[PDB]
């Protein structure tokens, strides 16, 4: 009866993010010191199977992609995790046509989902962004993407 756990991810799966009261960060070291939108009480949803959970309630040491652990960039002493995507992560202001565009909007390089984890009950959902086109925060933001391949 239980479906696939959200800790399991496969390439081509559709991810659905919600970032309540999301704010703006000038630079995220997980994205090579580039602007990002981050929320404290964010929620992640897998569209294909319908599984969803709050980002702060996920033990990111256990999550797997295609049977492999996520690539972790320990930047400035903070451990992040990578959920890659095929294409750019599409995000917009919640409930409205207000829509956002990522930092690498001009290139063919794909985007990724980054989450900072303390190991307890505090996780921050980071989505790539170019500027405050949806606002400097706290602003509700909703996102969507399709999971990509394992890092090489």
């Amino acid at each position, epitope marked *: 009866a239980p479906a696939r756990p959200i800790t399991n991810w496969r390439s081509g799966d559709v991810v659905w993010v919600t970032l309540p009261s999301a704010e*703006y960060a*000038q*630079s995220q070291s997980a994205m090579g010191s580039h602007p990002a939108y981050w929320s404290e009480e964010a929620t992640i949803i897998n569209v294909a199977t319908g599984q969803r959970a709050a980002v702060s309630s996920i033990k990111w040491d256990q999550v797997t992609l295609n049977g492999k652990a996520l690539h972790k960039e320990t930047h400035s002493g903070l451990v992040y995790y990578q959920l890659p995507l095929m294409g750019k992560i599409n995000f917009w202001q919640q409930g409205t046509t207000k829509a956002g565009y990522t930092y690498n909007y001009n290139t063919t390089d794909s985007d990724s989902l980054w989450v900072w984890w303390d190991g307890g009950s505090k996780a921050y959902l980071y989505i790539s962004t170019y*500027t*405050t086109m949806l*606002g*400097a925060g706290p*602003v509700n933001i909703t996102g969507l993407g399709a999971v990509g391949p394992n890092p090489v």
Partner: antibody, heavy 124, light 110 residues
Framework: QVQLVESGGGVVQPGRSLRLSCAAS????????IHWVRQAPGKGLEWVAL????????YYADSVKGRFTISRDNSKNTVYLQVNTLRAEDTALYYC?????????????????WGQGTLVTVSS | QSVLTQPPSVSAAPGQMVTISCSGS????????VSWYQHLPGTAPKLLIY???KRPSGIPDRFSGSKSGTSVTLGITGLQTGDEADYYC???????????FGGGTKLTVL
């Protein structure tokens, strides 16, 4: 107690330079962009300067360009506002405040907390 | 003389409504976001409206703001003697590459 205090006020001879040190406590300096803002007596607010999170970007105002200089020392968690050749128009209570907004074409400013201000009283 | 223009002053009876206009070109208020600031005398100015439509935590619900085209307007419901201060706009000028604040409006009660 999150605070962002300013020091370096007092009566100043005209045509001289000061360093408006800005000590920051209670928050991470490198996650914020610190603004500088002055209010002349009997007048309103006027934005002065701006520095990025890592000190890479330094932004000035049209009326303060050339005479003003912004600097950042993230090791000491203190942003430095170097005034130069103070005039009769900048005898103002220099507030300082932190911002977590952006600067690109659709910029949104969040100048969250403003300090109590330092009073430059350039006169005889 | 600021890019963002405001009425010099405004007044109303206690408990009433006031509104402060704030104009500008597309480079600052048409493209970028705007914010409002209250400067009670003797203390540091506060943030009451951000993102042209939202307020920080702790700001009373009686304050409101909304942008109509290349212009924004402050809205204060239920005027009080305590809420007598100077209100300023705040936004980024992409063309000028600088932060432009509002000219200044003074709330009074009589």
């Amino acid at each position: 107690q999150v605070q962002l205090v300013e020091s370096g006020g007092g009566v100043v001879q005209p045509g001289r330079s000061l360093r408006l040190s800005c000590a920051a406590s209670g928050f991470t300096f490198r996650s914020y962009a610190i603004h500088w803002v002055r209010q002349a007596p009997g007048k309103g607010l006027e934005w002065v300067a701006l520095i990025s999170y890592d000190g890479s970007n330094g932004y000035y105002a049209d009326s303060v360009k050339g005479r003003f200089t912004i600097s950042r020392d993230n090791s000491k968690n203190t942003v430095y506002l170097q005034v130069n050749t103070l005039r009769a128009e900048d005898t103002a209570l220099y507030y300082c405040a932190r911002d977590r907004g952006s600067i690109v074409e659709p910029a949104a400013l969040y100048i969250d907390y403003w300090g109590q201000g330092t009073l430059v009283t350039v006169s005889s | 003389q600021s890019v963002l223009t405001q009425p010099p002053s405004v007044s109303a009876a206690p408990g009433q409504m006031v509104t402060i206009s704030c104009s500008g070109s597309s480079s600052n208020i048409g493209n970028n976001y705007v914010s409002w600031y209250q400067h009670l005398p003797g203390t540091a100015p506060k943030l009451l409206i951000y993102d042209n439509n939202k307020r920080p935590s702790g700001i009373p619900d009686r304050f409101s703001g909304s942008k109509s085209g290349t212009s924004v307007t402050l809205g204060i419901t239920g005027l009080q003697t305590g809420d007598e201060a100077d209100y300023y706009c705040g936004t980024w000028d992409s063309s000028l590459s600088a932060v432009v604040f509002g000219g200044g409006t003074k709330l009074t009660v009589l």
